[PDB]
Write a protein that binds this ligand. Structure first.
Ligand SMILES: CCCCCCCCCCCCCCCCCC(=O)OC[C@H](COP(=O)([O-])OC[C@H](O)COP(=O)([O-])OC[C@H](COC(=O)CCCCCCCCCCCCCCCCC)OC(=O)CCCCCCCCCCCCCCCCC)OC(=O)CCCCCCCCCCCCCCCCC
Ligand SMILES: CCCCCCCCCCCCCCCCCC(=O)OC[C@H](COP(=O)([O-])OC[C@H](O)COP(=O)([O-])OC[C@H](COC(=O)CCCCCCCCCCCCCCCCC)OC(=O)CCCCCCCCCCCCCCCCC)OC(=O)CCCCCCCCCCCCCCCCC
Ligand SMILES: CCCCCCCCCCCCCCCCCC(=O)OC[C@H](COP(=O)([O-])OCC[N+](C)(C)C)OC(=O)CCCCCCCCCCCCCCCCC
Lengths: 459, 57
């Protein structure tokens, strides 16, 4: 994985040596070359994971998260540069350095062969994200939105750190390749109950779980666009990746310790979708919709059937692309009306027709229109949870109804109706913004032609 | 016919011919505890390095 870790680090001299007019262009170009290079990770086999070294490997789970991660960096550079036009040059290079450092941490987070290196990189991705949010944020309470996001991801990962070293002394290793073959079944005890809680609560907070989702609509609202994109697309998916690695060691205690968490997730995917019906803030609506979609991923990982893992990894990749495009559309209107209120700017299809078509596509992917990979992931999770219990279809179909409702309500509220009369700073859509929307949506539509590369290790 | 000794004579260390046997263990000690085995053998490199969680050297 060194052939991706080194050019990501070579983007640091590539961003601290360019001319004052060339620092966006060079980093965009060479991060696009790295994203093109990332497709060599699709050397995946039906039985054996692609094992590079003692430190890095990539099965069919980490590979699409890596391609999404290395693809997301040029998109964040294209998205973040318009509101840094009135920014100092050295602060601009520090912003690009935090994005490059976050990519560097993620591309060897997902390829952590050993689990405490996963913990170090997993907790090290916070600090560039925290600097981006609490330094290039917007409002007064960016310090509070960064405080709890440091607090919860350390108070939750403090039992995670203790639990992983406990396995290091018991099993003798935290190599996941070794721990596939030396895993002992975890019997019923209270000690193993708090062992399961210590292994799972950090990733529950990162997804987020319902009731633990209080950090996320605050943190997205206080973030800039690059922070919102990377939180919606990668940093939530760290928790799903970590659960899919960590439930190997947690059997069979998961089959009865998952019941409160599955009930929290199944009722929360209803409640957050109803909150999305009752939102005034557009970015908070996309935030709560992200919570609603990751609740199904929590359910699918906790029931641990093959259709559920296939649907959960398909839904993570699809929701990364969709929610990143939704936050970028919210930015494209916040760069014109300068407020996030959804009822403020209406009737935008009369003014921005092609941007309204990109809104239409993002909302149709958000409600899982077939044959998109949103629908493949949604449908497989619903199939597997029907196999878990036949009465879960009521909450599943009810969430799908409310999801269609708030996606088309968001579409109608921003893009339809009579426009606001007292707003006239609505410029035409730039070539940059349409390029950003197309680079989100066109891979999301190409993956429906060949969805087998995003269906995880047990396709 | 006795002669009083000179200065420094009565503080000389003399030798004594004795017929009693020498005390082989006058402190009446028991046997000493066996010392720990020393180090021996050529110092080979450490097998796969530090072995500290993931550090391959
Ligand atoms: C590998 C080779 C692949 C080659 C084939 C390509 C495969 C798909 C790739 C992506 C396709 C979508 C791109 C177009 C839509 C977005 C842009 C847009 O607004 O266009 C309007 C615009 C034309 O309109 P305009 O008058 O100029 O202005 C627009 C108005 O301002 C305002 O616009 P508007 O809103 O009034 O009108 C827009 C209209 C609005 O109408 C809709 O959005 C209705 C669509 C949904 C309902 C109907 C379909 C339901 C499902 C049935 C079909 C699927 C199953 C069929 C299979 C068989 C049966 C199972 O949408 C369309 O006309 C697009 C229809 C086709 C897109 C598919 C449906 C997307 C819906 C969401 C996802 C659904 C699930 C996934 C499906 C994936 C299929 C591959 O299009 C263009 O100018 C074209 C731009 C270039 C597009 C390139 C696309 C490919 C890029 C990939 C590059 C790399 C690969 C190389 C291949 C390149 C091939 C060219
Ligand atoms: C005949 C006579 C002549 C013969 C000549 C033969 C050689 C000719 C070529 C001469 C050049 C040789 C270069 C050194 C040997 C290869 C080193 C290497 O690639 O190791 C891969 C090493 C192990 O990968 P592998 O696939 O398992 O094994 C490949 C080799 O066999 C690795 O071999 P190994 O198994 O023996 O490695 C031992 C062990 C391998 O490592 C381990 O066993 C795991 C421990 C790794 C560190 C984990 C720390 C995590 C927590 C802290 C995170 C800090 C922030 C992250 C970085 C932020 C930005 C700096 O190394 C360490 O633990 C050292 C610490 C990591 C430094 C690696 C070398 C860095 C040199 C350049 C420094 C620039 C900063 C690099 C980032 C350092 C911090 C991560 O990769 C990593 O651990 C990933 C970390 C980053 C890789 C460093 C890439 C080196 C070149 C960078 C040039 C571009 C710099 C751009 C500017 C700086 C950034 C702003
Ligand atoms: C609660 C927050 C911290 C939880 C940390 C749990 C880490 C872990 O591995 O737990 C299993 C461990 C397993 O303990 P153990 O395995 O050492 O048990 C003794 C060993 N036997 C049974 C063989 C005799 O349990 C605990 O750590 C329990 C204590 C919880 C931590 C302190 C809580 C503070 C107050 C809240």
């Amino acid at each position: 994985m060194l052939k991706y870790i080194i050019p990501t680090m070579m983007l640091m001299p590539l961003t601290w040596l360019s001319k004052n007019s060339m620092i966006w262009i060079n980093t965009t170009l060479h991060s696009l070359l790295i994203s093109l290079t990332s497709l060599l990770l699709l050397n995946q086999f039906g039985d054996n994971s692609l094992n590079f070294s003692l430190t890095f490997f990539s099965d069919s789970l980490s590979t699409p998260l890596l391609i999404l991660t290395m693809w997301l960096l040029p998109l964040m550079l294209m998205a973040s540069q318009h509101h840094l036009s009135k920014e100092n040059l050295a602060r601009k290079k520090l912003f690009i350095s935090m994005l490059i450092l976050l990519q560097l941490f993620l591309i060897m987070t997902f390829t952590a062969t050993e689990l405490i290196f996963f913990y170090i990189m997993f907790e090290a991705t916070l600090v560039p994200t925290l600097i981006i949010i609490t330094r290039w944020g917007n409002q007064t309470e960016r310090l509070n939105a960064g405080l709890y996001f440091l607090f919860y991801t350390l108070a939750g990962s403090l039992p995670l750190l203790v639990a992983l070293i406990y396995i290091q002394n018991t099993m003798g290793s935290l190599n996941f390749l070794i721990l596939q073959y030396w895993v002992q079944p975890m019997p019923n005890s209270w000690s193993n109950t708090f062992m399961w809680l210590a292994c799972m609560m950090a990733f529950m907070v990162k997804m987020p779980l319902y009731g633990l989702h209080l950090w996320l609509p605050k943190a997205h609202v206080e973030a800039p666009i690059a922070g919102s994109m990377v939180l919606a697309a990668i940093l939530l998916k760290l928790g799903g990746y970590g659960m899919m690695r960590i439930t190997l060691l947690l059997n069979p205690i998961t089959d009865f310790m998952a019941y409160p968490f599955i009930m929290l997730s199944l009722w929360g995917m209803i409640m957050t979708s109803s909150i999305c019906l009752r939102q005034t803030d557009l970015k908070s609506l996309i935030a709560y919709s992200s919570v609603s979609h990751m609740a199904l991923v929590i359910v699918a990982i906790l029931i641990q059937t093959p259709w559920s893992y296939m649907g959960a990894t398909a839904l993570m990749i699809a929701h990364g692309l969709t929610s990143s495009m939704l936050f970028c559309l919210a930015n494209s209107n916040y760069e014109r009306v300068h407020s996030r209120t959804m009822i403020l700017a209406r009737g935008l299809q009369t003014l921005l027709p092609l941007m309204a078509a990109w809104w239409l596509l993002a909302s149709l992917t958000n409600l899982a229109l077939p044959p998109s990979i949103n629908l493949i992931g949604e449908l497989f999770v619903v199939m597997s949870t029907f196999s878990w219990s036949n009465i879960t279809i009521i909450l599943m179909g009810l969430n799908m109804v409310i999801t269609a409702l708030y996606s088309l309500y968001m579409l109608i509220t921003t893009q339809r109706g009579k426009h606001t009369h007292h707003i006239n700073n609505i410029l035409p859509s730039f070539t940059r913004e349409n390029a950003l929307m197309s680079l989100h949506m066109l891979p999301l539509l190409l993956l429906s032609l060949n969805p087998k590369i995003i269906l995880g290790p047990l396709y | 016919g006795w002669v009083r000794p000179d200065l420094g004579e009565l503080s000389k260390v003399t030798k004594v011919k004795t017929d009693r046997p020498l005390p082989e263990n006058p402190y009446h000690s028991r046997a000493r505890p066996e010392p720990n085995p020393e180090v021996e053998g050529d110092l080979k490199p450490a097998r796969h390095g530090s072995r500290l969680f993931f550090w391959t050297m």
